[PDB]
Design brief:
The protein is mainly α. The protein contains three helices and no strands. It binds one DNA strand of 40 nucleotides through residues 27-28. Belongs to the RNA polymerase beta' chain family. RpoC2 subfamily.
DNA sequence: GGGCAGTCGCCGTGTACCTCTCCTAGAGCAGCATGCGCCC
């Protein structure tokens, strides 16, 4: 595959985490929960918060 | 066809604690206690 490096930002990088529980409790609860429900995500409870 | 550029709508905006008040809805329908008129 090909790729290109990117520079994200403090709030864009924190909304792309692997756990939907930690992202839902930060900002934009409804959009995050809707996307997680559509994708059928699961959370394995790693890290604080 | 291929757009640039412009516009519109949604998201976000530090932490703990103390005191005073007002409100849980509002209109229809029937029961009741009161005031006043009536017949003896």
């Amino acid at each position: 595959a090909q790729f290109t490096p990117v520079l994200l930002g403090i709030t864009k990088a924190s909304l792309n985490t692997n756990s939907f529980i930690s992202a839902a409790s930060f900002q934009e609860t409804t959009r995050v929960l809707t996307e997680a429900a559509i994708e059928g995500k699961s959370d394995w409870l790693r890290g604080l918060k």
